[PDB]
Write a protein that binds this ligand. Structure first.
Ligand code: MG
Ligand code: MG
Ligand code: MG
Ligand code: MG
Lengths: 222, 196, 222, 212, 233, 195, 204, 125, 195, 196
C-alpha cells in the first residue's frame, strides 16, 4: 500500500533574546540510512522579519512554507501593505495546519521574529496547529536531546543559587546573541554526536530590527 | 495464454492459442484471442477475458468513429487508444494486449501493452503466461525481414513450446496474416504442432 | 555497521567502523567490531551486537580447546564451519553477519557468513548497512596482486565510504592485518577522522547549584 | 491534562494544569488550558491540544457574533451548545476534546457545562476532566462543601490540581486559577508545581509518601 | 494507490565546473524479468535540460507527454520561445515537483524518482531531485535507487562539497559517472549493460550519447574461486 | 474481584477489600472475603483473574503454614513478601502466568512495626504507607496523599479508610458491594464487622 | 504493553578525576499512575555499583541474582569482584536469556581497587557491553540524558564538580520525561569513600 | 433555474414590484394591533361577502408561531402561509440551539429578512 | 445511559430511567434526566451511544412541537411512535446511524388509554404492557411476567417498579445511581421526587 | 539462479551462473553453485544458499562415510541421500538441487530434486528462477549422445539466455565436466556468452 508520508530527518532550534531571535537548523536531508543532501536549507526568511522552519516530512515542510510565504504576500495585497506581526503569523499558521486536520502536514513548525514591542519571539506548532509562544524550543529528530539542555541553560531550570539551601532559584535573565549562538552550536554538535540523522552543517538565521542575518558552521559528516 | 505478433518482409502475423481457463478447468478450448479492431489492425488478447473484450470493443468503436471522420487510422494511433484505456484504468484492469497492423507506408508494426499501460514498439512481441517459456527460444530464432512461410513456422514452433509447458495454454494455434494482399486466417491443430 | 575484508600478496586484512546504534541513536561511538577467534584468525561482525560478540567468543573458546587437543594451529575453515553450523541451527535468529579471515598452516583465507548460515569465498568482501558504499569502492579500486600497504589503503577507504555515506556507520576505522609467517597486528583506531571540535563553552556549574535534601556515607567495607 | 471546575456559595472555581505530552515526551510545561471567551465566559481544554485550541477560539468568535446580532451576551447554555453541536457534526472523524464551559449570566447564575468530542453535554456543579481527573476528584470530593469561602475554594481547586500533577505522569507544570463571580472572571495566578508542592507539603503536612 | 509494473532502475548525476552530467541504463524490468532493452529513460527538454526518470515506465511515458506538451504550450504566443522565454531547467522542475506532490496528496502517485539536470540562462548548473512523495532535494551529486547507495559514495569522492565543483572537469566527471555505471552493473540485479549519458554544458550545450556499454570489467579472478569454504577442486 | 486497599498507620496495617463477585451481568455474591491469613501476624488480600486469585492465595498460605510448622517460628512480613514476590516473578515467565495482584499487611513482632507491601502479578514489590490495586488507586492515592499522616491511630486509619470507600462509592462505575476491613497489629488479625 | 516503559525510571553514570558518579531517579509507576517515590535503582556488591532501569520486577530479580553470584564469587575467590570482571558476569548472565530476556538497562560503575582506574559500562537488555570513557545513560529518558551529558560533560572533573554535572544531567532529563523523576539519588565514589546524596526535584 | 430579475430599480429609484406588493396589502382585510399595560390584542376584519362559510375549519387570521408569539397579516393569504411556516420552523430551531424561545424582536427580524430576500433574488416576486 | 424501564397500568404509563452518566472509570453525573417531553401527554426516554441519545431526543421533540404549533393539535401516542420508528428506520441505513433506543409513554386523550411503545435503534416498534432496553430486561421482564396485572393502579405500578429497581440494584454489575420516575396520565406528565 | 546438468556420450556436464542475491542486490557475483559431494558426483544448487550448503555438506559427509565402508557410491545413492534430507525436512527447506555423477557402468546420470523432495531421473535437467525462460529452447535443442563440444555449447547457449532474461541470474557461466578421463572445470565470461 502507498504510504504518503516520509521522514527526512534533521532537527531545528529557536531561541529568543531581548531584542533578537534566532532560528537554527542543520542542513542534512535523509531517507532511511542514506543522505540525500549535505546542504539543503530548511530555515527560511518569509518576509516581514519572520523566519520559519517546518521540520519532519520535507514535502509537507516545503508545501507549508510555500503557502505561508504566499499568505504574507496576499496579506499585503489585502491590507494596504501592513506588516504581518509575529502573533498574527502564528494564528495564520494554525489555520494553515488545522485546515489539514484529517490529513496532516507531518512537521514540527517553529517561527521566530520580534513581537510588536520589539522583543524577541519564538512560536512553536504541533503537526495540526496547536501553538504557544516560548523563549525556547527545539524541534525534529533530535528535539528530545536538545530541549532538556535548553531548559537548563536558557530558562535555568533545576539551577539554584549556591549556599541558599535550594530555596532561591537562579534568576531568569535575557541572553546576549553571542551567548545564544554558543548554546546553538553546542546543542547541534551534541545532537550530531548521538543522532545519526543530524550533521553535515548548521545554518542559523538571526532576526533583529535591522533584518535577517545568516551564519553557517560545519558539522560532522559521518 | 500464450500470444505473439511478428513483423516480416510483407507485413505482420499475429498468433495465439485457444485456451480460456478458470483455475484448472478449461472453460473454452477453441477461443479466438485474435481480435479485429480495424480492417488491417488486429490485437492479441491476454489476461482477463472480460477486460480485454471490453477494451477491444471500445477501441473498435473509437477507430470506427476515427475512420468516419479522418480515414484509415495508423497502427500507432490504435495502440495509443489501447494505451489510454489501459493506463487510465490500470487499477481496475488485468489486460496484456499486443497490437499489430499493416500500413502501406509503415508496413508491419507491433506494439505491446503490458499490465501498467506502457507502450513498447518492437520487431516482435510475446505475451501471456506461456510466453515466459519461449523468451529463450524466440530471441535465438527471430530474424528481421523473414518470409511469410518462415514467420508462420517461427510462430508455430514458438507457440508449440509455450503450449507444451504452460498448462494455461493449449488447443489450436490460430494465426492472422496482415499484408497488402489482405487478411488471411490460419489454424493449426494439435496433431501437427505437438510433434514439432 | 560497515565491515570489509581484503586479500593481498602474503595474507589478508580486515577493517570495520566503530559506530553502534539503537534506532536513530548512537549508543557507542567507539565500539570494537574486530574479534579475535584465535591469535591469527580474526572476525569482523555486523548485525545484532550481542550476537556477533557471543558467537565469536563461543567458537573462539571451542577453537582454543580444539587447538590444544590437536596440538595444531587452528584453521580458518574450522572457525568457518563451526560458525556456519551454529548460525544455521538457529535459523537466522542469531543475527550475526561475519567476515572471517586469517592465516594458518594451509595459507591465508577470507570468507563471509550470513546469519542464516551461508558462506562466501572472495578476495574482497563487505557486510553491514554500509556494505553498498564499501563495495562500490572495492569494485572500483580492487585489483589482483595487491601489496600489504595497498590492501590496508583499499580496506580503510572502503570503510570510510561507509562512515561518510551510511548513517548506520560512523566514527573510526579499526584494522587487523594477518600476514603469513608473522604475528597478526590489530590496529585499533587506525584512523580517527571524526574528532569532536572544541565546545564553545564550559558547562561547569558553580558548586552548590544543585539542591540537596540528604547526605550520608555509604559503607562498602565488611 | 487535569482540569476542574466547581460551583459553590461564591461562584465558580476553575483550575487547570499546564502540561502537554507526546507519548512519554513532555512537550510543554507552560500550556494555557483556560481560554477567556469574554469577561464572563471561560473554556477549559483537555484531549487534543489543537482540537481544543482551534475550536474553542472559534467558539469565542461565535459568541462575539451572537452579542453583535442579539445585542446581549450569550448564555452559558447556548455557548456550550454551539460547541457540542459543532463536535457532534464531526462525530466519528477523530476529534479528541474534553471541555468545560464556565460562566455567569443574569438569567442562569453561575453555570458549568461539560462538553466532549463524542457529543456529551452535561450541566453540573462539579466536573474533573483529563487523564488526571480521578486524582483531582479524590481530593476535591473529599473536601467539597457548598459553604466554602472564596479563599478556601481557591485553595481546594489549586490543591486538587496539585494532587493530580503529582500522581498523574501526564499532568504537571503549573496551576492556573480562576474565580467566576456575578461581576465576571478573576485570574488568581500561575503557580509552578516546582515550588507549590514543597510549600504545600511543609505548610499542610501532607505528601508523607515523598522523601522530605 | 498503485503498484509499479514495468520499472527502470538507477538514474545517476553530478555537477562539474561548466555543467552537469546525467546517466541511466536502457532497461525496462518486469519484476525479475529483464523485459525491455531499448528503453530511453533520459528525456531532453529543449537544448538546456535533461530529465532522468526511474520507477514505473507507464508513468514515465505519461511524464514524457507532459514535458512534450509543456514545450508546445510555452511556444504559444511567445516570440522569444527560443531565446529569453525558453523553458529553463528550474521551470521544468518546479512544474514536475508540483505535479508529483499533488498526485501524492490525492493518494494516486506517479511512481517515480526524477532527477532534473540542466544549465540555467545565466550559466548556473541546475541539478535537483523529486520523487513519488513530492520530496525534493539538491546536492552536487544525485542518484536514485541503488545509485543512491553505490554511485553517490563514488561520485562524492570527486565532488564532496560546493567548492569541489570548479575543480572538476567534464573528463573527470564523465569518467566517474561511467565507472559508477559499471559498478551498478556488477551489483544491481535489475541493471543492464547498455545505457545513455547526457552532458549539458554552458559552452558546448547538450551532448546526448546513446548505446553506451559498460566495459573494462574485472571477471578473471572468478576462475580462482571454487566452492564456498572447504572445497578445493 | 476489583477493589483492594491498604493503610499502614502508627501501630497497625488495615486492609479493605471489596465484597462483590461479579460474572457477566450478574453479581453472584456480595459477602466474598478476598483475603487469606498466611500467619498469625500476616494477612494477604488479592485481586485479579477468576480462579487464579484464590488458587494462588491458598498456595502461598499452605507454604507459609508449612514453614511455620517446620521451624516452629513465624516468618517476618518482609520475608513472606519476598517469598510471594519470587513466586510471582517465576510465574510471569511460565506457560500460564498467575494474573493476581496482592497486598500483604503484617506486624513484625521483632521490630514492633506495621508493614504494608504492594505486589503486582509481574512480581513488582514496594513497601508503602498506603497501597491499592487496579483502578482504585486512581482515586485513593491522591486522597491519601492529602489526608494521611504517619502517626495516625487505628481509629484515625479507619476514618481515613471510610473516606476512601465513600469516594469510590461516589465515582466508581461498578457496584462493589462495600468492603470487609481487617486490622493487623501486635495482637494479630481481627475483622471489623460494622463497616 | 512495552515492558521497558511500564514502570519508568533512569540511571546515569559518569567518570571524573580519580572518581566515578552514578545516579538514578526514585519513581516507580504503572504507566500513568505513580505508585512509589522510594524505588532506588542503584545497588552495590562490595565496591562495585550496579544501576538497573526497565521492568521493575526484573530490576529486583537481577539485583538479587547478582548479590547471589557475587557472594559465591567472594567465598571461592577470597576477594571482592572488580568492575571489569562484574561487567563480564552481567553480560554472560543477560545473554543466557537471549530469547527470553530480562527487560532491563543495567549500568556498572566503580573503581578498580588494584589499578585505581575509574570504570563505567552499559548494557542492552541482552548483554552487549557498552564501555565508555565519559558517561553511560539508561532508561525512559535516555535520549534526554544523552543530550544533557553530551553537552554538560567535560573530562577530569573533581568529585564536587562531577556531582553538580551529573545531578543537572539527571534532573533536567527527568523533567522532560513523564515516567521519570519523583526524587533522585546520586552516588559519588572515590577510592575509599562513597557519598550518597538525595536531590530536591519537582514532584510532578 | 428561472433567473429573471423581477424586482429592479426604475429611473426614479423605485422598485415597482415591491411597491405593487404593498397594493396587494392595501387590498387585504384590515388587521390591527394594540398593546396595553400587560397584554397585546390583535384584531382582524373578515369580509362578509362570504356567507355559507365554515368557521371551524377556515384558516384563522391570527396564527401562533410559538406558544408565546402570534402573527396576523394583511394581503395575499397563500403568501402568508409560506411566511408563517418558515417562522414556525425557525421558532423550533431557535429553541433547539439557544435552549430558549425566540424574542418577538428576533422572530420579527427573521420574518422581515425572508421578505427582504425575495426583493433581490432572481426568479421570485 | 443504560437503564430505562416502562410500565403501563390501568390509567397511566410510568417511566423509570437511571440517573448515572459514566465515562471511563468516572461517574460524571448522578442526576441525569434521560427523558424529553414530546407533547403534553407524551414522554420519551432514551438510552444508547453518547451524544446520539440527546441529539435524537431533542430532534424528535422539535418536530413534534413544530407539528403541535402548525395544527394546533396534539398527535396521538401511536402517531408519534410511528413517526419516531420511521426516523430510526431511515437512520439505520444512513452513513452514520443513530445508536439510540427509546421508550415512548403516552396517554391517548381520544381513547382515554395509557400506551407504552418500545423502539430500538433499528426501528423495531412494539406496544407493550411493560418494556425495558439493554441488559435491564434480562431481570425485569421475568419479574414483571410474575407480578404485573393489567388493572393495577398508579400506586401499585410504582410499587411494582420499586421491585424492579431493587432487583437491578442487587444483581446488576454497575452503579446506575437510582432512577428518575415520571408518570403519564390524563392530566399530563409529572415527576416523582422521592424514589 | 539458472542451473542445469546434461548427460552426453562420454559422461555428464553441470552448468551454473554465479549470482547470489538478497532482493535486487547482488551479494556475490562470482558464486560457485557447482558443488562436490564426491570425486565424480557433483550437484547444482538453487534456492536458499544456506539450505543448499548445509544439505551438500551433510551429503558429502554421508558419502565419505559410505565410501569408507562400501567403496564408491552410485549416483543414484547420492541422489537418494539428497532426497531423504529434502523430503523429510520439506517444511523447513528452500532447496532445488540437481545431482549429477559419472559411473563407469552407468556412465553419465542426472537426477533433479525440486522443492517437495521428489526425485526425477532425466537425460538433462534445468532448474532455478532462470530455467523458466529456457524450457522452450532446451527442449528444442537437446539431443541424446551429444559430444563434449556440443554439450558445452548447448549449456553455454542455454544459460546465456537464462541469464539474459532472469535478473536473479548473471556473472560467469561455470561448468564441470564429468567423464572417465577425470574432472574438468570450465569458466565463460560475459564478453563471450552475452553476444551469442
Ligand atoms: Mg555515516
Ligand atoms: Mg475487474
Ligand atoms: Mg498446455
Ligand atoms: Mg505528574
Amino acid at each position: 500500500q502507498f504510504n504518503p508520508y516520509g521522514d527526512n530527518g534533521g532537527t531545528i532550534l529557536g531561541i529568543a533574546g531581548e531584542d533578537f531571535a534566532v532560528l537554527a537548523g542543520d542542513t542534512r536531508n535523509i531517507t532511511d540510512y542514506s543522505i540525500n543532501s549535505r546542504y539543503e536549507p530548511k530555515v527560511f526568511d518569509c518576509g516581514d522579519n519572520i523566519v520559519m522552519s517546518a521540520n519532519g516530512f520535507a514535502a509537507d515542510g516545503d508545501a507549508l512554507v510555500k503557502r505561508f510565504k504566499n499568505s504574507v504576500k496576499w496579506y499585503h495585497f489585502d491590507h494596504n501593505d501592513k506588516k504581518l506581526s509575529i502573533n498574527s503569523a502564528a494564528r495564520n499558521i494554525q489555520h494553515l495546519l488545522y485546515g489539514k486536520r484529517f490529513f496532516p502536514y507531518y512537521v514540527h513548525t517553529i517561527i521566530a521574529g520580534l513581537d510588536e514591542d520589539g522583543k524577541g519571539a519564538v512560536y512553536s506548532f504541533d503537526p495540526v496547529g496547536s501553538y504557544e509562544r516560548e523563549q525556547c524550543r527545539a524541534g525534529g529528530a533530535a528535539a528530545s536531546l536538545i530541549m532538556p539542555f535548553l531548559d537548563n541553560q536558557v530558562n535555568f531550570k533545576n539551577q539554584y543559587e549556591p549556599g541558599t539551601n535550594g530555596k532561591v532559584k537562579k534568576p531568569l535573565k535575557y541572553l546576549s546573541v553571542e551567548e545564544v549562538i554558543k548554546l546553538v552550536r553546542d546543542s547541534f554538535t551534541s545532537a550530531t554526536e548521538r543522532h545519526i540523522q543530524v550533521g553535515d552543517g548548521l545554518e542559523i538565521l538571526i532576526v533583529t530590527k535591522d533584518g535577517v542575518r545568516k551564519e553557517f558552521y560545519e558539522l560532522k559528516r559521518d | 495464454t500464450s500470444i505473439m505478433a511478428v513483423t516480416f518482409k510483407d507485413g505482420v502475423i499475429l498468433g495465439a492459442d485457444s485456451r480460456t481457463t478458470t483455475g484448472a478447468y478449461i472453460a473454452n478450448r477453441v477461443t479466438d484471442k485474435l481480435t479485429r479492431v480495424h480492417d488491417k489492425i488486429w490485437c492479441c488478447r491476454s489476461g482477463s477475458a472480460a477486460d480485454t473484450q471490453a477494451i477491444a470493443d471500445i477501441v473498435q468503436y473509437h477507430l470506427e468513429l476515427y475512420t468516419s471522420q479522418y480515414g484509415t487510422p495508423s497502427t500507432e494511433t490504435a495502440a495509443s487508444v489501447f494505451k489510454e484505456l489501459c493506463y487510465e484504468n490500470k487499477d481496475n484492469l488485468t489486460a496484456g494486449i499486443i497490437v499489430a497492423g499493416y500500413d502501406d507506408k509503415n508496413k508491419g508494426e507491433v506494439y505491446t501493452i503490458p499490465l501498467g499501460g506502457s507502450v513498447h514498439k518492437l520487431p516482435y512481441a510475446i505475451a501471456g503466461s506461456g510466453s515466459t517459456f519461449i523468451y529463450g527460444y524466440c530471441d535465438k530464432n527471430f530474424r528481421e525481414n523473414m518470409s511469410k512461410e518462415e514467420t508462420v513456422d517461427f510462430i508455430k514452433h514458438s507457440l508449440s513450446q509455450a503450449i507444451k509447458w504452460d498448462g494455461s495454454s493449449g488447443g489450436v494455434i490460430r494465426m492472422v496474416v496482415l499484408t497488402a494482399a489482405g487478411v488471411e486466417r490460419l489454424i493449426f491443430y494439435p496433431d501437427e504442432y505437438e510433434q514439432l | 555497521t560497515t565491515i570489509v575484508g581484503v586479500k593481498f600478496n602474503n595474507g589478508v586484512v580486515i577493517a570495520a567502523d566503530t559506530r553502534s546504534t539503537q534506532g536513530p541513536i548512537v549508543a557507542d561511538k567507539n565500539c570494537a567490531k574486530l574479534h579475535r577467534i584465535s591469535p591469527k584468525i580474526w572476525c569482523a561482525g555486523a548485525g545484532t551486537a550481542a550476537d556477533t560478540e557471543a558467537v565469536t567468543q563461543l567458537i573462539g573458546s571451542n577453537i582454543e580447546l580444539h587447538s590444544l587437543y590437536t596440538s595444531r594451529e587452528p584453521r580458518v575453515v574450522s572457525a568457518l564451519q563451526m560458525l556456519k553450523q551454529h548460525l544455521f541451527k538457529y535459523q537466522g535468529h542469531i543475527g550475526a553477519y561475519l567476515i572471517v579471515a586469517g592465516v594458518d598452516p594451509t595459507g591465508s583465507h577470507l570468507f563471509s557468513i550470513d546469519a542464516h548460515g551461508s558462506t562466501d569465498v572472495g578476495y574482497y568482501l563487505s557486510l553491514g548497512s554500509g556494505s553498498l558504499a564499501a563495495m562500490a569502492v572495492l569494485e572500483s579500486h580492487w585489483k589482483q596482486d595487491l601489496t600489504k600497504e595497498e590492501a590496508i589503503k583499499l580496506a580503510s577507504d572502503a570503510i570510510q565510504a561507509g562512515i561518510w555515506n551510511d548513517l548506520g556507520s560512523g566514527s573510526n576505522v579499526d584494522v587487523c592485518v594477518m600476514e603469513i609467517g608473522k604475528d597478526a597486528e590489530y590496529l585499533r583506531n587506525y584512523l580517527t577522522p571524526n574528532v569532536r571540535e572544541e565546545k564553545q563553552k564550559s558547562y561547569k556549574f558553580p558548586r552548590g547549584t544543585t539542591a540537596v535534601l540528604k547526605e550520608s556515607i555509604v559503607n562498602i567495607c565488611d | 491534562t487535569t482540569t476542574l471546575a466547581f460551583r459553590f456559595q461564591g461562584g465558580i472555581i476553575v483550575a487547570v494544569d499546564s502540561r502537554a505530552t507526546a507519548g512519554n515526551w513532555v512537550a510543554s510545561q507552560t500550556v494555557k488550558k483556560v481560554i477567556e471567551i469574554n469577561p464572563f465566559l471561560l473554556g477549559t481544554m483537555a484531549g487534543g491540544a489543537a482540537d481544543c485550541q482551534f475550536w474553542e477560539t472559534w467558539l469565542g468568535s461565535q459568541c462575539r457574533l451572537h452579542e453583535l446580532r442579539e445585542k446581549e451576551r450569550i448564555s452559558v447554555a447556548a455557548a456550550s451548545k454551539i460547541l457540542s453541536n459543532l463536535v457532534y457534526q464531526y462525530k466519528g472523524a477523530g476529534l479528541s476534546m474534553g471541555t468545560m464551559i464556565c460562566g455567569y449570566t443574569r438569567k442562569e447564575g453561575p453555570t458549568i457545562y461539560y462538553v466532549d468530542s463524542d457529543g456529551t453535554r452535561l450541566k453540573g456543579d462539579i466536573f474533573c476532566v483529563g487523564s488526571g481527573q480521578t486524582f483531582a476528584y479524590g481530593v476535591l470530593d473529599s473536601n467539597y462543601k457548598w459553604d466554602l469561602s472564596v479563599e478556601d475554594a481557591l485553595y481546594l481547586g489549586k490543591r486538587s490540581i496539585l494532587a493530580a500533577a503529582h500522581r498523574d505522569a501526564y499532568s504537571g507544570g503549573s496551576v492556573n486559577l480562576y474565580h467566576v463571580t456575578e461581576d465576571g472572571w478573576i485570574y488568581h495566578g500561575n503557580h509552578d508545581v516546582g515550588e507549590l508542592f514543597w510549600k504545600v507539603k511543609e505548610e499542610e503536612g501532607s505528601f508523607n509518601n515523598v522523601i522530605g | 494507490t498503485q503498484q509499479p509494473i514495468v520499472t527502470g532502475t538507477s538514474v545517476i548525476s553530478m555537477k562539474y565546473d561548466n555543467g552537469v552530467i546525467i546517466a541511466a541504463d536502457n532497461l525496462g524490468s518486469y519484476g525479475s524479468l529483464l523485459r525491455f532493452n531499448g528503453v530511453e529513460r533520459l528525456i531532453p527538454v529543449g537544448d538546456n535540460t535533461v530529465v532522468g526518470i526511474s520507477g514505473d515506465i507507464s508513468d514515465m511515458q505519461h511524464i514524457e507527454r507532459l514535458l512534450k506538451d509543456l514545450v508546445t504550450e510555452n511556444a504559444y504566443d511567445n516570440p522569444l520561445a527560443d531565446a529569453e522565454e525558453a523553458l529553463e531547467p528550474s521551470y521544468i522542475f518546479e512544474y514536475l515537483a508540483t505535479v508529483m506532490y499533488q498526485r501524492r496528496s490525492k493518494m494516486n502517485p506517479l511512481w517515480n524518482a526524477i532527477i532534473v539536470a540542466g544549465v540555467q540562462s545565466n550559466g548556473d548548473q541546475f541539478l535537483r531531485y523529486v520523487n513519488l512523495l513530492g520530496v525534493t532535494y539538491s546536492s552536487p551529486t544525485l542518484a536514485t535507487g541503488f545509485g543512491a547507495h553505490m554511485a553517490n559514495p563514488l561520485l562524492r569522492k570527486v565532488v564532496d562539497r560546493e567548492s569541489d565543483i570548479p575543480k572538476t572537469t567534464v573528463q573527470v566527471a564523465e569518467e566517474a559517472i561511467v565507472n559508477a555505471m559499471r559498478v551498478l552493473y556488477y551489483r544491481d540485479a535489475r541493471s543492464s549493460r547498455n545505457f545513455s549519458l547526457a552532458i549539458i554544458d554552458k559552452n558546448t550545450g547538450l551532448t546526448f550519447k546513446k548505446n553506451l556499454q559498460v566495459e573494462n570489467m574485472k571477471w578473471d579472478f572468478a576462475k580462482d574461486i571454487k566452492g564456498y569454504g572447504t572445497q578445493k577442486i | 474481584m476489583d477493589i483492594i486497599l491498604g493503610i499502614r498507620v502508627q501501630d497497625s496495617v488495615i486492609l479493605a477489600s471489596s465484597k462483590a463477585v461479579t460474572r457477566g451481568i450478574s453479581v453472584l455474591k456480595d459477602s466474598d472475603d478476598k483475603t487469606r491469613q498466611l500467619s498469625p501476624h500476616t494477612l494477604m488480600s488479592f485481586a485479579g483473574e477468576a480462579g487464579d486469585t484464590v488458587q494462588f492465595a491458598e498456595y502461598i498460605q499452605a507454604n507459609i503454614q508449612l514453614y511455620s510448622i517446620r521451624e516452629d517460628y513465624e516468618l517476618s512480613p518482609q520475608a513472606v513478601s519476598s517469598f510471594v514476590r519470587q513466586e510471582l516473578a517465576k510465574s510471569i515467565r511460565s506457560r500460564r502466568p498467575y494474573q493476581v495482584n496482592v497486598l500483604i499487611g503484617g506486624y513484625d513482632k521483632k521490630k514492633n512495626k506495621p508493614e504494608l507491601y504492594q505486589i503486582d502479578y509481574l512480581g513488582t514489590k514496594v513497601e508503602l504507607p498506603y497501597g491499592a490495586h487496579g483502578y482504585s488507586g486512581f482515586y485513593t492515592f491522591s486522597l491519601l496523599d492529602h489526608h494521611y499522616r504517619p502517626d495516625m491511630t487505628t481509629e484515625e486509619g479507619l476514618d481515613l479508610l471510610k473516606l476512601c470507600v465513600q469516594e469510590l462509592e461516589k465515582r466508581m462505575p461498578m457496584d462493589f458491594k462495600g468492603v470487609i476491613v481487617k486490622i493487623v497489629d501486635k495482637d494479630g488479625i481481627r475483622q471489623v464487622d460494622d463497616f | 504493553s512495552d515492558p521497558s516503559s511500564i514502570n519508568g525510571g533512569i540511571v546515569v553514570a559518569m567518570t571524573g578525576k580519580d572518581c566515578v558518579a552514578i545516579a538514578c531517579d526514585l519513581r516507580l509507576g504503572s504507566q500513568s499512575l505513580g505508585v512509589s517515590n522510594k524505588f532506588e535503582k542503584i545497588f552495590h556488591y562490595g565496591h562495585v555499583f550496579l544501576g538497573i532501569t526497565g521492568l521493575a520486577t526484573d530490576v529486583t530479580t537481577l539485583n538479587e541474582m547478582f548479590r547471589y553470584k557475587t557472594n559465591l564469587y567472594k567465598l571461592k575467590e577470597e576477594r571482592a569482584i572488580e568492575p571489569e570482571t562484574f561487567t563480564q558476569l552481567v553480560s554472560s548472565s543477560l545473554y543466557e536469556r537471549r530469547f527470553g530476556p530480562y527487560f532491563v538497562g543495567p549500568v556498572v560503575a566503580g573503581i578498580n581497587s588494584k589499578s585505581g582506574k575509574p570504570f563505567i559500562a552499559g548494557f542492552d537488555l541482552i548483554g552487549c557491553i557498552d564501555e565508555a570513557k565519559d558517561f553511560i545513560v539508561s532508561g525512559t529518558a535516555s535520549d534526554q540524558l544523552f543530550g544533557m551529558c553530551e553537552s554538560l560533560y567535560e573530562p577530569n572533573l573533581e568529585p564536587e564538580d562531577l556531582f553538580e554535572t551529573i545531578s543537572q544531567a539527571l534532573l533536567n532529563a527527568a523533567d522532560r520525561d513523564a515516567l521519570s523523576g519523583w526524587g533522585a539519588v546520586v552516588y559519588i565514589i572515590k577510592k575509599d569513600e562513597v557519598v550518597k546524596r538525595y536531590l530536591k526535584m519537582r514532584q510532578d | 433555474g428561472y433567473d429573471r430579475a423581477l424586482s429592479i430599480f426604475s429611473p426614479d429609484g423605485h422598485i415597482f414590484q415591491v411597491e405593487y406588493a404593498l397594493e396587494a396589502v392595501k387590498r387585504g382585510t384590515c388587521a390591527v394591533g394594540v398593546k396595553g399595560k400587560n397584554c397585546v390584542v390583535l384584531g382582524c376584519e373578515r369580509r362578509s361577502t362570504l356567507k355559507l362559510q365554515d368557521t371551524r375549519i377556515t384558516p384563522s387570521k391570527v396564527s401562533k408561531i410559538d406558544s408565546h408569539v402570534v402573527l396576523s397579516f394583511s394581503g395575499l393569504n397563500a403568501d402568508s402561509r409560506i411566511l408563517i411556516e418558515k417562522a414556525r420552523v425557525e421558532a423550533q430551531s431557535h429553541r433547539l440551539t439557544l435552549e430558549d424561545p425566540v424574542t418577538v424582536e428576533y422572530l420579527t427580524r427573521y420574518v422581515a429578512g425572508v421578505q427582504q430576500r425575495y426583493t433581490q433574488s432572481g426568479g421570485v416576486r
